[PDB]
Design a protein around this nucleic acid. Structure first.
Ligand SMILES: [Mg+2]
Ligand SMILES: [Mg+2]
Ligand SMILES: [Mg+2]
Ligand SMILES: [Mg+2]
Ligand SMILES: [Mg+2]
Ligand SMILES: [Mg+2]
Ligand SMILES: [Mg+2]
Ligand SMILES: [Mg+2]
Ligand SMILES: [Mg+2]
Ligand SMILES: [Mg+2]
Ligand SMILES: [Mg+2]
Ligand SMILES: [Mg+2]
Ligand SMILES: [Mg+2]
Ligand SMILES: [Mg+2]
Ligand SMILES: [Mg+2]
Ligand SMILES: [Mg+2]
Ligand SMILES: [Mg+2]
Ligand SMILES: [Mg+2]
Ligand SMILES: [Mg+2]
Ligand SMILES: [Mg+2]
Ligand SMILES: [Mg+2]
Ligand SMILES: [Mg+2]
Ligand SMILES: [Mg+2]
Ligand SMILES: [Mg+2]
Ligand SMILES: [Mg+2]
Ligand SMILES: [Mg+2]
Ligand SMILES: [Mg+2]
Ligand SMILES: [Mg+2]
Ligand SMILES: [Mg+2]
Ligand SMILES: [Mg+2]
Ligand SMILES: [Mg+2]
Ligand SMILES: [Mg+2]
Ligand SMILES: [Mg+2]
Ligand SMILES: [Mg+2]
Ligand SMILES: [Mg+2]
Ligand SMILES: [Mg+2]
Ligand SMILES: [Mg+2]
Ligand SMILES: [Mg+2]
Ligand SMILES: [Mg+2]
Ligand SMILES: [Mg+2]
Ligand SMILES: [Mg+2]
Ligand SMILES: [Mg+2]
Ligand SMILES: [Mg+2]
Ligand SMILES: [Mg+2]
Ligand SMILES: [Mg+2]
Ligand SMILES: [Mg+2]
Ligand SMILES: [Mg+2]
Ligand SMILES: [Mg+2]
Ligand SMILES: [Mg+2]
Ligand SMILES: [Mg+2]
Ligand SMILES: [Mg+2]
Ligand SMILES: [Mg+2]
Ligand SMILES: [Mg+2]
Ligand SMILES: [Mg+2]
Ligand SMILES: [Mg+2]
Ligand SMILES: [Mg+2]
Ligand SMILES: [Mg+2]
Ligand SMILES: [Mg+2]
Ligand SMILES: [Mg+2]
Ligand SMILES: [Mg+2]
Ligand SMILES: [Mg+2]
Ligand SMILES: [Mg+2]
Ligand SMILES: [Mg+2]
Ligand SMILES: [Mg+2]
Ligand SMILES: [Mg+2]
Ligand SMILES: [Mg+2]
Ligand SMILES: [Mg+2]
Ligand SMILES: [Mg+2]
Ligand SMILES: [Mg+2]
Ligand SMILES: [Mg+2]
Ligand SMILES: [Mg+2]
Ligand SMILES: [Mg+2]
Ligand SMILES: [Mg+2]
Ligand SMILES: [Mg+2]
Ligand SMILES: [Mg+2]
Ligand SMILES: [Mg+2]
Ligand SMILES: [Mg+2]
Ligand SMILES: [Mg+2]
Ligand SMILES: [Mg+2]
Ligand SMILES: [Mg+2]
Ligand SMILES: [Mg+2]
Ligand SMILES: [Mg+2]
Ligand SMILES: [Mg+2]
Ligand SMILES: [Mg+2]
Ligand SMILES: [Mg+2]
Ligand SMILES: [Mg+2]
Ligand SMILES: [Mg+2]
Ligand SMILES: [Mg+2]
Ligand SMILES: [Mg+2]
Ligand SMILES: [Mg+2]
Ligand SMILES: [Mg+2]
Ligand SMILES: [Mg+2]
Ligand SMILES: [Mg+2]
Ligand SMILES: [Mg+2]
Ligand SMILES: [Mg+2]
Ligand SMILES: [Mg+2]
Ligand SMILES: [Mg+2]
Ligand SMILES: [Mg+2]
Ligand SMILES: [Mg+2]
Ligand SMILES: [Mg+2]
Ligand SMILES: [Mg+2]
Ligand SMILES: [Mg+2]
Ligand SMILES: [Mg+2]
Ligand SMILES: [Mg+2]
Ligand SMILES: [Mg+2]
Ligand SMILES: [Mg+2]
Ligand SMILES: [Mg+2]
Ligand SMILES: [Mg+2]
Ligand SMILES: [Mg+2]
Ligand SMILES: [Mg+2]
Ligand SMILES: [Mg+2]
Ligand SMILES: [Mg+2]
Ligand SMILES: [Mg+2]
Ligand SMILES: [Mg+2]
Ligand SMILES: [Mg+2]
Ligand SMILES: [Mg+2]
Ligand SMILES: [Mg+2]
Ligand SMILES: [Mg+2]
Ligand SMILES: [Mg+2]
Ligand SMILES: [Mg+2]
Ligand SMILES: [Mg+2]
Ligand SMILES: [Mg+2]
Ligand SMILES: [Mg+2]
Ligand SMILES: [Mg+2]
Ligand SMILES: [Mg+2]
Ligand SMILES: [Mg+2]
Ligand SMILES: [Mg+2]
Ligand SMILES: [Mg+2]
Ligand SMILES: [Mg+2]
Ligand SMILES: [Mg+2]
Ligand SMILES: [Mg+2]
Ligand SMILES: [Mg+2]
Ligand SMILES: [Mg+2]
Ligand SMILES: [Mg+2]
Ligand SMILES: [Mg+2]
Ligand SMILES: [Mg+2]
Ligand SMILES: [Mg+2]
Ligand SMILES: [Mg+2]
Ligand SMILES: [Mg+2]
Ligand SMILES: [Mg+2]
Ligand SMILES: [Mg+2]
Ligand SMILES: [Mg+2]
Ligand SMILES: [Mg+2]
Ligand SMILES: [Mg+2]
Ligand SMILES: [Mg+2]
Ligand SMILES: [Mg+2]
Ligand SMILES: [Mg+2]
Ligand SMILES: [Mg+2]
Ligand SMILES: [Mg+2]
Ligand SMILES: [Mg+2]
Ligand SMILES: [Mg+2]
Ligand SMILES: [Mg+2]
Ligand SMILES: [Mg+2]
Ligand SMILES: [Mg+2]
Ligand SMILES: [Mg+2]
Ligand SMILES: [Mg+2]
Ligand SMILES: [Mg+2]
Ligand SMILES: [Mg+2]
Ligand SMILES: [Mg+2]
Ligand SMILES: [Mg+2]
Ligand SMILES: [Mg+2]
Ligand SMILES: [Mg+2]
Ligand SMILES: [Mg+2]
Ligand SMILES: [Mg+2]
Ligand SMILES: [Mg+2]
Ligand SMILES: [Mg+2]
Ligand SMILES: [Mg+2]
Ligand SMILES: [Mg+2]
Ligand SMILES: [Mg+2]
Lengths: 76, 63, 97, 44
RNA sequence: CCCCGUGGAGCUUUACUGCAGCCUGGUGUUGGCUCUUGGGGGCCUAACCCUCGGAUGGGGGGACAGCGCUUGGCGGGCAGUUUGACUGGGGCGGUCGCCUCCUAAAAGGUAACGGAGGCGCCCAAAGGUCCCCUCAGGCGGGACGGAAAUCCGCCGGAGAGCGCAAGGGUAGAAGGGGGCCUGACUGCGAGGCCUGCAAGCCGAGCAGGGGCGAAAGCCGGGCCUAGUGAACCGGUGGU
RNA sequence: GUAAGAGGAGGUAUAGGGAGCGACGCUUGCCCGGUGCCGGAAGGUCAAGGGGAGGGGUGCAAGCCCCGAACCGAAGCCCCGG
RNA sequence: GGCGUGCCUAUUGAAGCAUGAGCCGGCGACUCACGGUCGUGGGCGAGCUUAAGCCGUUGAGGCGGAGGCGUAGGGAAACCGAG
RNA sequence: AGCCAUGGGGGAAUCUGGGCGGACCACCGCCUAAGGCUAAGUACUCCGGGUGACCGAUAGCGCACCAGUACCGUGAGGGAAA
RNA sequence: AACCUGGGGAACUGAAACAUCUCAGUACCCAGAGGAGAGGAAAGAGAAAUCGACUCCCUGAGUAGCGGCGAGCGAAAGGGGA
């Protein structure tokens, strides 16, 4: 019957959708690879995690052959 | 009669002035080997509990 | 029936030796805010004579408060509280021990 | 093989992991100590 | 009957831990003479033991044995106990933590002794940075070669590679090569992800002193997700 | 039975204790590697103890106090045989 | 004539062919002590309160500050102090 | 791991003597082992008395009454009703 | 009757198993003491160059400590009293 196995659920995916206000440093997206590329005011960590770089608003940009991007349009 | 303080607790926890309860971070005396220097630097700072803060406090009281 | 949380660890070192307690002079702190509660002069004796001290023996004046000019004895003073009282009056240090 | 670096003209330590048999007989990479600043560190 | 209870009891042993008992060194009770290199051999008598028609004595043993304290050992004769859970009843078999995919019903999460596979490591280069280069495959041509070694030409956007399972990602590099290199730094850490707890994860920036770069900058190990263990008790180094 | 003592026995190996087989007849084969038991003045390991190179605490010193190597140490186990 | 599946218990589910009860009367099960933690009624307030005991009394109370909680926290500690 | 006590082995001194103040040493101090006695304050309640926001005959002691009785059990012991 | 001292001394139980540990020097057995028994005039306490026999209460204090540092166990100096 050798089969009763699996591994923990990692609860990844988009953590902050477009339009949502965000504090600097808080996380935008956890992902397997780069299903989302960083972009303006958004850094990326060892696991490919995208995190806002300054208080602002999240917005997503698709750029075809160049992939999708997550941006934080600042304001204060 | 007359509750005795739980010595096991007192030996590893403190009630803060506001009624919080703190203790050293676990996992820093063994698993050690080369865990990111960051980890152990953060296993040094002590923390506060949550609900067992209340479980914990009851075990004291004369304290 | 698993671990309580007794998973946490004792840091409080020196939780005791065999004979245990070492008798060393205990200092009770007392702010000069409660000290201005009156006037004349103050000493350990007078302080215990009402609310504060409670025979904790070693007096140590300190802390926030508007200092009255009066003379005050103590087993020790706050670096900062010392200046406040010295900057309006005078006061002697401990007896000795 | 498990390992920890020692500072020269002193006795500081740090997290480390050698590899024994494989190409690695000597080891003395750099590492910043708390006292002083920057120095070689022996295997030990 | 059957199963359950961190129930009971009788029995067993090369289950654990003890105990009686038996073995054993040292020492007390414990003395004399002699040979020998505190030990060994021999003799003695008076301790101590046995015995003899009372014995204050005779005979036998004899510093042994017995007994006291202490050393180690053998030790179901005996004693106290342990002997897991899941489980289409229980035992037998199988399984127990971690990662990947599917089941999972287009957020997250989601069960079954549902379908399938991996981890308990590895690397001082397989790391940091600067600089340069771009796969697999197919066809054609080429002394060994012969489907396939190395060379040339044309097509080829990724089907290659990325240490290792799978997945996601990826040449506008994360892949191949080179120069210098050790940031597989110390002191911290705004704000988050995840979450019953405890844990786990990401992290801008500040300070110190550094590495590569002309510089903008990048570096707090490795394309990422497994490679692991609270507390207790003890070891080594240091203030 | 803690002991004193008692049974064994007021017996003495043609006796007493334990074990297994179970009148009688004919028989009872091979293995001693493992386990037990028996034998083995060697050797190996082995406790308290003896020993005291060397080391430490403290005092001004005389000293006091602790640690400790080689070596000598029984049964048991290993080993050798039945 | 219409209508109508005892009571309790235990259960996913009981009139149940699951439990307990022949009937009646009486006995019969969430207490107290000390220590906690909230709430609440009052007394006092940077203070509040006494314990054993002593003096009264014989269902009268007072005295007694030793001591306790509070007025400062942070640190393993040395120590420092509104930090 | 001192102090107090002591089963085993070794084994002193009489104040220049001894014990102790938590291993040990120095310093500074405390106390005088190895003989015995001593009231009061303390504990208890068979017995007497006083008092209960104590019971009121299934209660209150097991027993308000001829009860540690009848009865039960070899016995230790159990034990009513009224 | 109970109270007391000395000589011996359990287990269920708790630790949600169990062996150190707990229950506990409790239950109980034995010897003895008396209206009480024990203790008792420092070879003490322990940090004050301080206290001054013993017993009892309050406090110190669930403190100092002890502890498979688990369950749990738990002092003394000092201060107020008899
Ligand atoms: Mg098959
Ligand atoms: Mg599964
Ligand atoms: Mg894509
Ligand atoms: Mg980074
Ligand atoms: Mg720890
Ligand atoms: Mg602890
Ligand atoms: Mg003491
Ligand atoms: Mg390894
Ligand atoms: Mg290895
Ligand atoms: Mg079990
Ligand atoms: Mg024995
Ligand atoms: Mg002998
Ligand atoms: Mg012997
Ligand atoms: Mg002898
Ligand atoms: Mg002898
Ligand atoms: Mg000689
Ligand atoms: Mg000689
Ligand atoms: Mg003779
Ligand atoms: Mg003779
Ligand atoms: Mg004779
Ligand atoms: Mg003769
Ligand atoms: Mg003779
Ligand atoms: Mg002998
Ligand atoms: Mg003997
Ligand atoms: Mg034996
Ligand atoms: Mg044997
Ligand atoms: Mg054995
Ligand atoms: Mg055994
Ligand atoms: Mg079935
Ligand atoms: Mg089955
Ligand atoms: Mg079976
Ligand atoms: Mg099985
Ligand atoms: Mg599953
Ligand atoms: Mg495999
Ligand atoms: Mg690589
Ligand atoms: Mg190029
Ligand atoms: Mg082909
Ligand atoms: Mg071809
Ligand atoms: Mg060709
Ligand atoms: Mg070709
Ligand atoms: Mg060719
Ligand atoms: Mg050729
Ligand atoms: Mg061919
Ligand atoms: Mg060809
Ligand atoms: Mg070509
Ligand atoms: Mg061509
Ligand atoms: Mg492509
Ligand atoms: Mg493809
Ligand atoms: Mg691919
Ligand atoms: Mg590959
Ligand atoms: Mg790879
Ligand atoms: Mg892939
Ligand atoms: Mg691109
Ligand atoms: Mg490369
Ligand atoms: Mg490269
Ligand atoms: Mg290279
Ligand atoms: Mg910050
Ligand atoms: Mg944070
Ligand atoms: Mg959490
Ligand atoms: Mg909790
Ligand atoms: Mg950074
Ligand atoms: Mg800098
Ligand atoms: Mg960075
Ligand atoms: Mg690593
Ligand atoms: Mg790599
Ligand atoms: Mg990288
Ligand atoms: Mg790389
Ligand atoms: Mg992942
Ligand atoms: Mg433990
Ligand atoms: Mg015997
Ligand atoms: Mg005897
Ligand atoms: Mg006889
Ligand atoms: Mg006989
Ligand atoms: Mg006879
Ligand atoms: Mg015979
Ligand atoms: Mg025979
Ligand atoms: Mg045969
Ligand atoms: Mg044959
Ligand atoms: Mg054999
Ligand atoms: Mg054989
Ligand atoms: Mg043989
Ligand atoms: Mg044999
Ligand atoms: Mg065998
Ligand atoms: Mg053998
Ligand atoms: Mg054997
Ligand atoms: Mg022989
Ligand atoms: Mg030998
Ligand atoms: Mg040999
Ligand atoms: Mg050896
Ligand atoms: Mg020795
Ligand atoms: Mg010296
Ligand atoms: Mg010296
Ligand atoms: Mg000197
Ligand atoms: Mg000196
Ligand atoms: Mg010396
Ligand atoms: Mg020795
Ligand atoms: Mg020899
Ligand atoms: Mg031997
Ligand atoms: Mg054997
Ligand atoms: Mg032979
Ligand atoms: Mg009808
Ligand atoms: Mg119905
Ligand atoms: Mg009812
Ligand atoms: Mg019916
Ligand atoms: Mg039935
Ligand atoms: Mg039933
Ligand atoms: Mg019924
Ligand atoms: Mg019922
Ligand atoms: Mg009936
Ligand atoms: Mg209640
Ligand atoms: Mg209440
Ligand atoms: Mg109030
Ligand atoms: Mg009061
Ligand atoms: Mg007064
Ligand atoms: Mg007074
Ligand atoms: Mg603290
Ligand atoms: Mg002592
Ligand atoms: Mg002795
Ligand atoms: Mg003399
Ligand atoms: Mg002289
Ligand atoms: Mg003494
Ligand atoms: Mg003394
Ligand atoms: Mg001493
Ligand atoms: Mg003393
Ligand atoms: Mg001392
Ligand atoms: Mg002294
Ligand atoms: Mg003294
Ligand atoms: Mg005297
Ligand atoms: Mg005498
Ligand atoms: Mg005397
Ligand atoms: Mg005498
Ligand atoms: Mg007396
Ligand atoms: Mg009473
Ligand atoms: Mg009574
Ligand atoms: Mg009476
Ligand atoms: Mg009466
Ligand atoms: Mg009434
Ligand atoms: Mg009646
Ligand atoms: Mg009536
Ligand atoms: Mg009755
Ligand atoms: Mg009567
Ligand atoms: Mg009857
Ligand atoms: Mg009856
Ligand atoms: Mg006894
Ligand atoms: Mg037990
Ligand atoms: Mg038991
Ligand atoms: Mg238990
Ligand atoms: Mg209980
Ligand atoms: Mg239990
Ligand atoms: Mg059991
Ligand atoms: Mg244990
Ligand atoms: Mg005890
Ligand atoms: Mg006792
Ligand atoms: Mg007794
Ligand atoms: Mg007596
Ligand atoms: Mg009296
Ligand atoms: Mg008396
Ligand atoms: Mg006496
Ligand atoms: Mg005197
Ligand atoms: Mg002391
Ligand atoms: Mg005086
Ligand atoms: Mg004193
Ligand atoms: Mg006094
Ligand atoms: Mg008290
Ligand atoms: Mg322990
Ligand atoms: Mg005890
Ligand atoms: Mg006192
Ligand atoms: Mg006073
Ligand atoms: Mg007094």
């Amino acid at each position: 019957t050798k089969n009763g196995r699996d591994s923990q659920a990692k609860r990844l995916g988009v953590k902050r959708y477009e339009g949502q206000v965000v504090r600097a440093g808080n996380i935008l997206v956890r992902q397997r690879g780069t299903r989302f590329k960083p972009g303006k005011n958004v850094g990326m960590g060892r696991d490919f995690t995208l995190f806002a770089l300054v208080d602002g608003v999240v917005e997503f940009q698709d750029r075809g052959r160049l992939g999708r991007y997550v941006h934080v349009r600042p304001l204060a | 009669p007359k509750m005795k303080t739980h010595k096991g607790a007192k030996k590893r926890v403190k009630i803060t002035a506001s009624g919080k309860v703190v203790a050293m971070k676990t996992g820093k005396r063994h698993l050690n080997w080369q865990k990111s220097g960051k980890e152990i630097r953060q296993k040094g700072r002590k923390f506060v509990l949550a609900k067992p803060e209340a479980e914990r406090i009851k075990l004291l009281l004369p304290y | 029936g698993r671990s309580t949380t007794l998973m946490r660890l004792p840091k409080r070192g020196m939780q005791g030796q065999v004979p245990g307690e070492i008798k060393r002079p205990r200092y009770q702190g007392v702010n000069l805010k409660d000290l201005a509660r009156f006037e004349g002069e103050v000493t350990p004796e007078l302080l215990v004579r009402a609310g504060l001290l409670k025979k904790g023996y070693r007096l140590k004046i300190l802390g926030e408060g508007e200092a009255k000019p009066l003379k005050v004895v103590a087993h020790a003073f706050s670096k900062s509280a010392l200046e406040k009282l010295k900057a309006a009056g005078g006061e002697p240090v401990l007896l000795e021990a | 093989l498990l390992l920890e670096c020692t500072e020269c003209k002193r006795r500081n330590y740090a997290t480390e992991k050698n590899k024994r048999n494989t190409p690695n007989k000597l080891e003395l990479r750099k590492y910043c100590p708390w006292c002083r600043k920057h120095t070689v560190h022996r295997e030990v």
